Design a protein around this ligand. Sequence first.
Ligand SMILES: CO[C@H]1/C=C/O[C@@]2(C)Oc3c(C)c(O)c4c(O)c(c(/C=N/N5CCN(C)CC5)c(O)c4c3C2=O)NC(=O)/C(C)=C\C=C\[C@H](C)[C@H](O)[C@@H](C)[C@@H](O)[C@@H](C)[C@H](OC(C)=O)[C@@H]1C
Lengths: 1113, 98, 224, 230
Amino acid sequence: KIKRFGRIREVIPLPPLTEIQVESYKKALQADVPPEKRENVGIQAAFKETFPIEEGDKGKGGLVLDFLEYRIGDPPFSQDECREKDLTYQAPLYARLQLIHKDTGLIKEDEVFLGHLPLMTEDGSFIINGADRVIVSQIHRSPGVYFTPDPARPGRYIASIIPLPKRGPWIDLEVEASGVVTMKVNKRKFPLVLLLRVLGYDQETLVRELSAYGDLVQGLLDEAVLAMRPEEAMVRLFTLLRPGDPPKKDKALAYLFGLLADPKRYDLGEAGRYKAEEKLGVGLSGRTLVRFEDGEFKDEVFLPTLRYLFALTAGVPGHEVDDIDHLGNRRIRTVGELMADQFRVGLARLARGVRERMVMGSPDTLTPAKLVNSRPLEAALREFFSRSQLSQFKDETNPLSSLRHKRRISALGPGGLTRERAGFDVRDVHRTHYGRICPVETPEGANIGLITSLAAYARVDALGFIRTPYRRVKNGVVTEEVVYMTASEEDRYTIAQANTPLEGDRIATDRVVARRRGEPVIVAPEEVEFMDVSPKQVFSLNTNLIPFLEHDDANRALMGSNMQTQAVPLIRAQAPVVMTGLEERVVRDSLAALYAEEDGEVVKVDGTRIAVRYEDGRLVHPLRRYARSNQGTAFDQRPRVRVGQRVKKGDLLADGPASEEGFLALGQNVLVAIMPFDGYNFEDAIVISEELLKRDFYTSIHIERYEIEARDTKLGPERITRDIPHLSEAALRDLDEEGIVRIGAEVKPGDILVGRTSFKGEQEPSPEERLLRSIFGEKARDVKDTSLRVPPGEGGIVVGRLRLRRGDPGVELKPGVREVVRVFVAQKRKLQVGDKLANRHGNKGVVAKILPVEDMPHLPDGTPVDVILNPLGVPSRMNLGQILETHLGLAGYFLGQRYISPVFDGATEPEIKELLAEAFNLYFGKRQGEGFGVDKREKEVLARAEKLGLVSPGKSPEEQLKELFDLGKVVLYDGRTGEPFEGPIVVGQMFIMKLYHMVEDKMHARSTGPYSLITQQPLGGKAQFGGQRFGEMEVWALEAYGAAHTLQEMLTIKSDDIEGRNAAYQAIIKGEDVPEPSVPESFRVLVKELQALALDVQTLDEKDNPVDVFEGL
Amino acid sequence: MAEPGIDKLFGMVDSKYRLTVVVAKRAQQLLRHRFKNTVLEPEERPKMRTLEGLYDDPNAVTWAMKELLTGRLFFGENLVPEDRLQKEMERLYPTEEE
Amino acid sequence: LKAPVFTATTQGDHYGEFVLEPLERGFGVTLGNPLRRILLSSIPGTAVTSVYIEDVLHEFSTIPGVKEDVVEIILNLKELVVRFLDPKMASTTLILRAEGPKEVRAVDFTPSADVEIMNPDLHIATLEEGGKLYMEVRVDRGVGYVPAERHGIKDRINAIPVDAIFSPVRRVAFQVEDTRLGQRTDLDKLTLRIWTDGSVTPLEALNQAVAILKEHLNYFANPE
Amino acid sequence: ESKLKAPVFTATTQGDHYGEFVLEPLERGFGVTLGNPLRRILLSSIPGTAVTSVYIEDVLHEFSTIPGVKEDVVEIILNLKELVVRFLDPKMASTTLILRAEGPKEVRAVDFTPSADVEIMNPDLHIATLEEGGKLYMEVRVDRGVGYVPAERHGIKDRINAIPVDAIFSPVRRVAFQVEDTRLGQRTDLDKLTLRIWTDGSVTPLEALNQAVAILKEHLNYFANPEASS
Ligand SMILES: CO[C@H]1/C=C/O[C@@]2(C)Oc3c(C)c(O)c4c(O)c(c(/C=N/N5CCN(C)CC5)c(O)c4c3C2=O)NC(=O)/C(C)=C\C=C\[C@H](C)[C@H](O)[C@@H](C)[C@@H](O)[C@@H](C)[C@H](OC(C)=O)[C@@H]1C
């Protein structure tokens, strides 16, 4: 019983969502295609790109070496086998080269063993060194040229972007006050007529033939001295490039910055010609400037823009087009692209090495595999993958999360001029980009805009670049839009009339303005490409997950959009009552759950593996059980069906960590009743009814991991033993079998999680001791009890252990580090006082109290409510639709129904009312069933609600109930007082998820414990644990106050002042006396720290000449 | 509401920090060493409440604020010798335990 | 007047609307609630205290050959309601062995002594192709709600102690209708129902209840 | 070491009223379970003695003013309401009260026809002031009641001319109670009832409570012998 609400849906959200990646790497890692086809980008590009290593003297003798195929292949171990042994799931990539000569010879070392390449799991990410990571896609200005208004003072400039940050120079031509036209390639500033001269243009042939309608020229001529002779020119320019190299005429170097598609080419033809040609005059060719034609250089783009500049400086073509942020200039470097360039980088070093060898060595002693030293593609490539800031940890608290992590567009990346946390033009940028093909309400905090998500239906098709959404054009198809799409306007979804949508007023979007209704009403070829396949496309994948966004105010809606992520799989996930269609997917493209293959059948046996789907061959399916999450969430997989076929409205076949059977179920939906509660729901705190716990509802499991490394220090090998000195207490083997704790070994804080022994020789015991030792058989010792022990964290049953030691296979371990024990501990975490409950509409609040079913608002029939979500502020303050759900709540409680009310499409107040008309003729239908009806209380109420003009007076009591039910909710007693709550109190089944916080993890408490021997303030220890911070703000607080003593205490008797400190842990342990300081441990060390620099800090008393007696001990 | 009549104390002293200071040293010489410097022992002594009944509270400042709202005590440049200010404490059994 | 009509439409171990009659305009709840209160709270019951399974170290497991999952298994048993047929038993320990294919629904427990698996069916474990389950699962007599505090020692090894939910009362409400002749349409018509129960009977809940409230009421005896 | 299964009931016996009481350790969920019904019942069900119908020779209804009398019907009317009578032997359904008014002097609730078996608990009580026109004659009625009752009982008595006042019979006249948590028993979430019965409509506080404690007790009984259906 699932009631849908809606309209149209011409296509699909576009699988697999994890397509930004996945289908990205592959098309970059072309590999999987017979070495005959596939031509550019990534893998091969970088290959072909990296020009065949030339050598000494431009083709004078032997040694050329060209590249042929590439071979990814025979992978090392195996996923899981990696994460286990900390192996970076890679694969051998060798490449077939063949150096040429000039004395007969064409050697070809097959394969030529080479660097390793990390593969992308089916999931769409990589395992690096054991842990899971995802390559977040950044955005920069799409290669080209756009000019832009000179920020200084009115007077535009010219910027010339390059293919990708790490490739080609980012030039800028600026018309200035003092100087006139500066060409600033990389780090330089040289007159612009200078390069022009070389290129050819110059006095008269240049100006008075280029620049006329807008002077600005007398200055472009001042150094005509430069514009008097090319060649000598390159040299003056060359001589303008540090350091003092040979002014000798070269052409080389400038054999780049234009010449050879080697360090300056947006190749193919796309993204560069199209740009300028449709910005500048028109016409061009692959790369700026063109040399090696025959001596001189035939430039393409340089003066025409200088031209198009002045035209923008008093002319008409104007267009101050800047980093216009128009996603017609916002490139999106997919992983493969990011991973590509890094592969480019590697070769930008492989070669250096080869060129180096080509020389030294002898022509015949030289052959591939020898000039090649497969070290650069490693490092330069492994360094990127797991050492970038764009190569993050896997967010995996709830299945949606990790999914979302790929659908993410980053911007705080490494790219060139890539807005740093506060890069030049932070704010302003953030702003919603009218180009709505990227989430409109996803950002977080203090990091606004920069980190956006991605439109659901966004991007797909021959991808040169930028997101492009979907748009109808009269049933046709969808024509993958194009950010700089003008297609005579688009008409916002709705007005549907089967196929002709008779409107008269088509609410449509054209360019920017929400222009009324162009009304092209062309029916066929829909007003250009008007219409939008569903509204979802104006939104991000996890926002969609809001059954009533339409009402939810954008802003607050983001506190749900985001927050939702911070979920955390529970034991009884349950999809959400009201829910928007998408859920049937987000947890299926997440590959978090198991998907049957061809047809049906089964066999199984049940448990730790759905045993095959008996159609054709056979494949027992292992079910990732009580694993472990990056966030320590603990995602697992439940199964389904004994003997069946392929599907039933879903070929699920075993759930996952949050699917209510293929239905993303982040949290559990329960019954709430709005209304303050004697103060337990203040500000935003929620009130739980113990019941929840009793029925193990919001309970969540978490399995932590611990780690002790057995070093080797020059005092005696650090070893994991069960014979820990004097620890003898029946603890060791009371658990810890043969060294490490056992499984199921329930653990408390303090136990010997894992124990090992160091040698550390602090002192040599003189006799007397060895004597007593000998005498009182005090067998000497050479070992410390350095164990592992479970920290202040309550501990919990020991879910599993793992052991890794060198000598073992793949295992690569920190020099010296011999063996590295690992132990996972589980923790069923029910629900406590603290924790954020936060739902979908962003009603994030922390739990305050959990009342006994005793108290708590009694519904009439006696059922208790579940959560007492406060109204105050909350909705009014935040204005949202967390209500339309609570209303369609009971109207889905008694009617036993789940509901599909998608974003901006259906589930209308009146329909809900109908759905509320029903459920009553039963909810109340029961009273006149069990044999009851309206009691002296509901009489009191109604006769007060109607007074509050809430109910239609004149109707009967009973009639007033249905009235007061298709909105609020029946009287609603108070099991605590026995009486009622004058004035109805709306009730319903919201749906509150439970975020990753849950108190426990927060809250420590120090009194003394561990003192640090490096700094000297409270912290780092082993026994108990604590430490707290006193960041200046609190200092002012005290200053502003007057707790001088209370202050000097937090910089003395409580941290560094060893004397005073002790005076504290003693003056108390003693009794009737409190901490008596005097000389501050700090003042005493300021003088004897300045004296080191040979400064006398004579301390003087009142009379100036009573000269202190400090440190006089 | 607050303490044993703060407003009352803030009246006596002039500089709000005075009272703070006097009440401080006070308790810090009261049950800080001795215990027999009370002025509330006639029948107006601070007592608590737990399982077996009352029991004056170890909180020294407590008495002070109450022993100060009383009548005894003084403060200024009086008693001069801080030395003989505690030396006289010898004339009447002090010391603690270790 | 001076006397009510303690009507009592009973049932078969559950339900149990219990009507008083012409109650003075007001007492409908003076009595009507405290009972429902008590009924829900304090009152003896029977709850699963601890459970040991064949080849299972501790919770967070996965018995080969069974569909379910020990947690689930324990999440289900958490609902088993046993009757005791006697009064001397701090508790007993149920048993259960199950072969190859089938469902270990509640019933399947060891038919034994003063113990009524009041709630058969109660899907306990859809095991199959690998009949393997032997379980020893305690069942103490408790009161109220007592979680992972009351250790499930017993089998001192893999007890994997389970949460306890003792109250046999499964829900309670009470109409205060007005439909009597007594003296001037005023009076309340109390009528609590002490709905569903674990093992015990509403008339017993309703009774035991009136007891505690009378027992406490007393306390306002001798003042100091 | 003190609390267990035997809470300490602590009174305050302010005397004629304000019976601040304090039974203590109670399992979370009884400071309510008890405090309320008592408080509830306290405000109601409890024998009384409240003027309920008045007659003052001369002007009919209540909306008036009798010359040579500083007050006006209502003021007197209301005064009367604060009158505290008490009856001697059991067989006194209600003996009326009549009055004698003199010159300027005050008409305390004492002047009342000093009838035995019915002594006005409260001597003073303004009642009304009269001067150079010492008329004011009244023969007010009194009654035995349960709680509180408006102008619906009708002041029969003196047939016509009654301006029947409201039936405020219940010695208790305000009942509050807050159950804070205390942790004598180690556990820190135990209940601490505490009541405070303001009564003076005649009967003492502790009396009210106990009496009501009985009132509830007895009713509980009812849940004894049943007549069910299968
Ligand atoms: C190697 O990557 C690093 C580069 C740093 O350098 C630097 C300058 O470049 C960054 C880039 C390129 C980002 O894209 C980024 C980011 O996307 C993000 C946060 C931080 N956001 N959180 C602040 C705290 N709050 C409670 C939640 C939101 C960031 O600070 C950064 C960030 C940087 O600081 N997040 C979000 O947008 C949101 C909304 C959610 C993300 C989910 C979880 C939280 C993450 O997955 C966690 C688990 C980790 O991935 C990070 C710690 C990465 O560290 C590692 C080792 O993995 C870090 C990105």
